[PDB]
Amino acid sequence: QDLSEALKEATKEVHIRAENSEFMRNFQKGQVSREGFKLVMASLYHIYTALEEEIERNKQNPVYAPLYFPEELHRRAALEQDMAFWYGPHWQEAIPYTPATQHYVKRLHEVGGTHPELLVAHAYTRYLGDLSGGQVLKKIAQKAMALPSSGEGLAFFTFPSIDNPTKFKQLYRARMNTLEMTPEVKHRVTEEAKTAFLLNIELFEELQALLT
Numbered sequence: 001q002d003l004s005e006a007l008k009e010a011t012k013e014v015h016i017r018a019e020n021s022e023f024m025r026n027f028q029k030g031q032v033s034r035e036g037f038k039l040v041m042a043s044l045y046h047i048y049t050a051l052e053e054e055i056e057r058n059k060q061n062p063v064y065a066p067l068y069f070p071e072e073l074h075r076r077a078a079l080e081q082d083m084a085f086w087y088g089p090h091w092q093e094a095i096p097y098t099p100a101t102q103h104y105v106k107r108l109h110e111v112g113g114t115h116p117e118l119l120v121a122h123a124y125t126r127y128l129g130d131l132s133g134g135q136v137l138k139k140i141a142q143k144a145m146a147l148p149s150s151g152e153g154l155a156f157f158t159f160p161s162i163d164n165p166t167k168f169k170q171l172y173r174a175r176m177n178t179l180e181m182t183p184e185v186k187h188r189v190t191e192e193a194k195t196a197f198l199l200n201i202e203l204f205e206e207l208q209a210l211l212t
Ligand code: HEM
Pocket: 004, 007, 008, 015, 018, 019, 020, 024, 124, 125, 126, 128, 129, 130, 132, 133, 134, 136, 137, 166, 169, 197, 200
């Protein structure tokens, strides 16, 4: 069984739980406000910063290299633009760093520094989601908060280097199947992907609690 299929099958149930989390449920209803959106985007800034820092550390490592797509996927630069938009010129010292966010970042550095062979699980969970449900959220966010089609404030959800996300995802899944794979690595990677989904669910549950 190819890794791409193993990952889809391994995370299909927790995905349902994540897509139906209270924060996302409200988001999908269009009940997202500036305060809530700033909280999640600021948390993603910390998360993607840590993820991409570990990706850079392991870009030459064969256990990850085939999936090294900085130009097409990396979000840090986009998030820095969004942070300046939502938080202003001094966003660096204005944005929050919640406990759930720190926990996520913590696991990211553990994987990147000690278990690099599992890094693919974390890139898969965030990036492929960004190119799927993330595109739906972008549309909802634009309508709910009156964000311009010009993209300001939603740079994170925009991939100017990917003409067709559907096609890119297929390329990505295929590339995931070229990584050196053993029963040991395959089992652990699917396990870490489930953990990645849980870290996201816990972030959303936390943010929702902070807002309510
Ligand atoms: C906001 C609610 C969500 C919606 C509307 C949504 C919707 C979708 C849809 C329609 C697909 C299928 C795309 C395809 O076959 O190419 C998908 C795939 C995916 N989603 Fe979500 N999603 C949501 C939440 C999430 C969350 C919170 C995560 C984890 C951060 C996530 C990560 C993924 C991943 C990793 C895939 C790719 C699965 C695969 O093809 O192996 N999604 N999502």
